[PDB]
């Protein structure tokens, strides 16, 4: 498919939201990314 | 058009308006359909002018018939703003009346005569 530039910025963003909860946020909060998404398993909008 | 049953020669309309301008500076004139109407009704009207380019015609339709059953003579004027200008107004006027002419009684008298003959 041919993605537009906006579609891309979004796909981009979605990709970053897909990272882990930084190691330090764990210690800082004295101890889960509920928005983790697999390319195959899950499905993005658009 | 609906209230106009006779055509007044361009020349006649010129004399008449002329007479009106001197009527304002000599004697007295009434500017406006309401004020005119009352003269015809009060009798204080020697000669009344009615524009032909009035829309709605309602505003003037009555002048003719009224005048007749009041002996008051009346004359037509093509342009509305021409009668208004003569009468001395910056604006135009649907109708005006010469409430007691003045140094025009001669001509006015004739205009009235000229129109009656013009039927």
């Amino acid at each position: 498919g041919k993605k537009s530039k906006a579609t891309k910025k979004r796909l981009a963003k979605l990709d970053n939201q897909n990272s882990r909860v930084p190691a330090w946020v764990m210690l800082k909060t004295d101890r889960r990314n509920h928005k983790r998404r697999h390319w195959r398993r899950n499905d993005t909008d658009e | 058009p609906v209230y106009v049953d006779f055509d007044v020669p361009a020349d006649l309309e010129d004399d008449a308006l002329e007479a009106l301008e001197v009527a304002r500076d000599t004697g007295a004139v009434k500017k406006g359909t309401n004020e005119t109407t009352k003269s015809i009704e009060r009798g204080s009207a020697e000669l009344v002018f009615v524009a032909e380019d009035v829309q709605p015609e309602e505003i003037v339709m009555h002048i003719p018939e009224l005048a007749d059953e009041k002996g008051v003579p009346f004359i037509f004027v093509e342009q509305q703003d021409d009668l208004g200008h003569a009468a001395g107004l910056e604006v135009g006027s649907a109708a005006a009346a010469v409430t007691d002419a003045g140094e025009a009684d001669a001509d006015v008298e004739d205009i009235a005569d000229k129109v009656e003959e013009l039927r």
Binding site: - | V2, Y3, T37, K38, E41, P56, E58, I59, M61, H62
Partner: protein, 194 residues
């Protein structure tokens, strides 16, 4: 003595006889070829206009609105309907054509507010009403002691809320006594029974 106006009014008491009659037989010919809403420089019925609030001033507009005649243009039911609700032909709208005209006009002038309206005749299939509108933002009006009332915010869209004259009459608010139990203070407050 009788005022000039009185003659205009007296002429319309019978729009089918005399000069006015001939006038109409003509005007409609052009009206018929005009639009739904035609702004007009001068009211056809001066007495009536003036009588309803009209003033030769700035911010005061007049427009003739054409609306069709007859009952409601209704679509027959496409689902179960007991015989009582199977009607189509005899059903009529609860808003008189004049109120419909007032609305169609006001929509044509989104900035203006309807002050009033009056009838100016009808031919075989349509009715014409002249609506008097007012520019609530023109200072020539904000300073008019006889019209600045129409400028208040709560007078916004007054025609669409039936605050017009023909509006209030059509809402059955004319009587202050008998017969107005279900109408005043509001139809909707009375459970829509009026």
């Amino acid at each position: 003595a009788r005022s000039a106006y009185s003659y205009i009014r007296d002429a319309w008491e019978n729009p089918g006889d005399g000069q006015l009659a001939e006038l109409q037989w003509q005007r409609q010919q052009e009206w018929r070829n005009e639009g739904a809403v035609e702004r007009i420089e001068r009211p056809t019925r001066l007495d009536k206009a003036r009588s309803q609030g009209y003033k030769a001033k700035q911010g005061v507009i007049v427009a003739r609105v054409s609306v069709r005649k007859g009952s409601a243009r209704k679509r027959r039911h496409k689902a179960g309907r007991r015989s009582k609700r199977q009607g189509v032909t005899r059903i009529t709208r609860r808003k008189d054509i004049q109120r419909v005209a007032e609305e169609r006009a006001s929509r044509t002038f989104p900035n203006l507010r309807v002050l009033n309206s009056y009838s100016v005749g009808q031919d075989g299939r349509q009715k014409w009403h002249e609506v008097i509108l007012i520019d609530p933002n023109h200072p020539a009006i904000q300073n008019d002691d006889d019209l600045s009332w129409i400028c208040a915010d709560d007078q916004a869209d007054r025609v669409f809320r039936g605050l017009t004259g023909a509006g209030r009459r059509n809402r059955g608010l004319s009587g202050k006594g008998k017969g107005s139990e279900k109408t005043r203070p509001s139809l909707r407050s009375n459970g829509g029974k009026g």
